[model samples]
Target: MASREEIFSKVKSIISEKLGVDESQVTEEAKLIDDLGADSLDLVDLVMDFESEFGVKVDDADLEKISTVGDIVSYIEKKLG
Candidate 1:
């Protein structure tokens, strides 16, 4: 089972690569749109990448709830468990 720290690390790396931002900026409280500068297209691509990387399906409802990097980490950690 993947731990929360492990999940957070992967989530940070994915967001960093996708958003072209530094890993240091992808913190738990960082907002995907505001802090990370992600637009709609970026969000779409991010969801796809996250689904593939974590092997978890992200429905529209879940996508709507996701706003911050911590949200992604928690979602993945829950799904993984």
Candidate 2:
């Protein structure tokens, strides 16, 4: 089974690569849009990458609740478990 730390680490790395930021800057409390400076297209691509990486299906309606990296981590945690 995958651990939360492992999941979060991958999430941060993915966001960092896509957003051109350091993975260290991608923290759990960081807001995806405001803090990370990810625009709509960036977010869409991130979502696609996340689904592809995790094999999780996150619909557009589900995205409205995911505003932070922590939110994504938690969601992945729940889905993974």
Candidate 3:
């Protein structure tokens, strides 16, 4: 299983690459929509990318709770168990 820092780093890299932003832009407190400027379609694509990258199926309810980098890392950690 990947550590939380590992998952967070991966999430950061993925978000940065997908959003065409620098890693510095993705902080633990940044909101996916408000801070990152990701629209619905982009958010969906990110979720899909995360699911594919982590090999985990994140349902809509689960996705709703994920708002920041820490949220994504925590969710993946829980799903991994």
Candidate 4:
């Protein structure tokens, strides 16, 4: 099983690469929209990427709860278990 920080590292990579944001900005405190400039459509694509990379299902309900980079990491941690 992947550790939380390990998952966070991958999440940061995905968010930065997929969203066209600076990898440095992909931190625990960075908001997906306010910081990374992501739109709803972009979020859907991000979700798809995350699902593909992590092999986890993130339905609309889960996606809605994710607002920050940390949220993505924590969500993946939860799904991993």
lDDT of 1 by residue, 1-81 (tens): 678888877776777776677867786788888887897788878877879988778878888888888888888888777
RMSD of each: 1.4, 1.3, 1.3, 1.5
Clash count, predicted structure 4:
0
For candidate 2, the lDDT comes to 0.82
- Candidate 3 achieves a global lDDT of 0.81
Worst 10 residues of 2 by lDDT: 19-28
Query: Which rank order by TM-score, best down to worst?
Result: 2, 3, 1, 4
Reference-based TM-score, model 4: 0.84
Q: List the residue pairs that clash in candidate 2.
A: none
The parts of candidate 1 lying over 4 Å away from their true place are: none
lDDT for each residue of candidate 4 in 1-81, tens digit (9 for 90 to 100): 689878877776777777666767787788888888888887778777889898878878888888888888888888888
lDDT of 3 by residue, 1-81 (tens): 579887887887778888888867676778778888987787888878889998889889887888876677788888988
Whose lDDT is higher: candidate 3's or candidate 4's? 3
Residue 70 in candidate 2 has what lDDT? Answer: 86
Can you give the lDDT of residue 45 in candidate 4? 82
The lowest-lDDT stretch of 10 consecutive residues in candidate 4 is: 14-23
After TM-score superposition, what is the CA distance of residue 60 in candidate 3 from its true location, in Å?
0.3
> Total backbone clashes of model 3?
0
Candidate 2 stretches with Cα past 4 Å from truth are none
Error of 1 at 35 (Å): 0.5
TM-score, predicted candidate 1 vs. hidden true structure: 0.86
